Amino acid sequence: KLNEDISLIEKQTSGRIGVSVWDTQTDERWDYRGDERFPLMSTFKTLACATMLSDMDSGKLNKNATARIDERNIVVWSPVMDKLAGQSTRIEHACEAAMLMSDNTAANLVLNEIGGPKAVTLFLRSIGDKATRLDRLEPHLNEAKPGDKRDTTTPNAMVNTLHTLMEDNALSYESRTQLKIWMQDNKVSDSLIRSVLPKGWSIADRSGAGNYGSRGISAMIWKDNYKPVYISIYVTDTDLSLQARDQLIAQISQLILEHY
Numbered sequence: 001k002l003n004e005d006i007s008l009i010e011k012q013t014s015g016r017i018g019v020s021v022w023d024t025q026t027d028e029r030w031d032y033r034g035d036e037r038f039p040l041m042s043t044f045k046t047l048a049c050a051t052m053l054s055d056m057d058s059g060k061l062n063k064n065a066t067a068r069i070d071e072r073n074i075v076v077w078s079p080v081m082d083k084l085a086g087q088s089t090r091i092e093h094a095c096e097a098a099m100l101m102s103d104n105t106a107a108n109l110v111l112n113e114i115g116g117p118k119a120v121t122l123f124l125r126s127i128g129d130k131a132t133r134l135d136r137l138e139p140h141l142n143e144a145k146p147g148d149k150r151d152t153t154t155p156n157a158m159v160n161t162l163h164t165l166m167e168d169n170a171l172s173y174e175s176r177t178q179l180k181i182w183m184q185d186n187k188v189s190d191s192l193i194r195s196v197l198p199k200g201w202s203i204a205d206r207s208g209a210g211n212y213g214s215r216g217i218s219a220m221i222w223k224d225n226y227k228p229v230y231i232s233i234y235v236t237d238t239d240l241s242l243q244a245r246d247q248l249i250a251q252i253s254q255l256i257l258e259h260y
Contacts, residue, residue: 005255006032009248015213015237017248020155021256022163025227034156037131038234039144041208042102043158043218044120044134044151046183048110049095050165051123053175055114056092065091067109076139078105099182099206104138111137117151124161127170131157144210146237155232158218163230166220180204183220191246192217193231193253198260201226207249213238215245231256 002019010017018033040047055061071085080097081089082105091113097106111117117134124132135141135150143151164170165179183204192207205219216234233252235245 002030002255003032006252009252013235013238013240013248015235017252018155018232018234018236019252019256020159020230020232022159022230023227024163024167024229031156034159034232035131035154037149037152037154038216038236039142039208039210039212039214040132040134040151040153041142041144041210041214041216042107043153043206043208043216044141045098045102045107046165046179046206046218047124047132047134047161048107048114048120049099049182050171050175050179051120052091052095052110052114053171053179054123057172057175061091061114063092065113067091067094067113069105069109073105073108075104075108078103081105081109096182099179100185100187102188102207108137127161127164127168129157129161129164132161142208142210142214144212144214144236146212155234158232159230162218162220163228166228189217192249193219193221193233195246195250196254196257197221198257209242209245210236212236213240213245215240215242215249217249 018038020031020034022029056063066088068088069081069084074082080101080103094106094109097103120134132153141151189207201221203221207217214236219231220228222228
């Protein structure tokens with residue numbers, strides 16, 4: 001009764017909820033507004049780092065490539081890169097900061113090295129994601145204005161793309177392994193799926209928050225004896241506080257995890 005439960009929760013908000021689940025053990029798929037657009041917010045960081053790794057794989061970017069952090073470019077929430085003004089950092093280390101800490105200056109540095117939002121969107125189209133579009137840098141991409149297609153994805157597209165990145169040949173073994181470790185090591189999403197994840201499950205995730213009371217998460221969960229389950233949960237156009245959005249994602253996660 002997942003559809004009924006999510007519909008009840010959605011009706012309690014003034015906004016829209018989007019969920020997508022692909023269980024690769026049972027091969028069952030399920031979605032709620034799975035093909036509707038929602039803001040990417042920081043969930044794009046996985047996709048910028050996948051593009052950077054794909055560039056390293058083909059030799060288009062050196063594995064030890066560096067870029068300078070300029071003080072004028074330090075943006076909101078840069079807990080790792082705000083110590084590095086006037087210094088050079090490895091682009092690999094900037095992706096680590098973007099993935100583990102959601103560092104915005106780090107994510108912008110990666111974008112600026114690889115050809116920006118247009119290059120990330122081209123990489124996504126090249127791997128079969130027809131819907132996701134990255135248009136702006138941090139923090140402008142968090143606008144999440146209803147009706148604005150910039151910096152959006154769909155719950156189904158994020159599930160499909162994460163599955164492609166982990167199980168198809170979009171990235172080399174070393175690159176998809178590094179991307180999975182960065183997602184497992186994520187330090188900023190403890191209040192979301194992780195807060196209600198049963199014992200026995202590993203998780204690799206990436207979350208985001210935005211304006212218009214928005215929140216989202218893209219994740220994969222698995223066990224040694226259970227093939228990965230890809231999940232997208234997005235909420236937008238609400239008047240919810242950040243703590244309330246976290247509770248909403250946790251409560252939706254509880255509903256999905258119940259049948260296990």
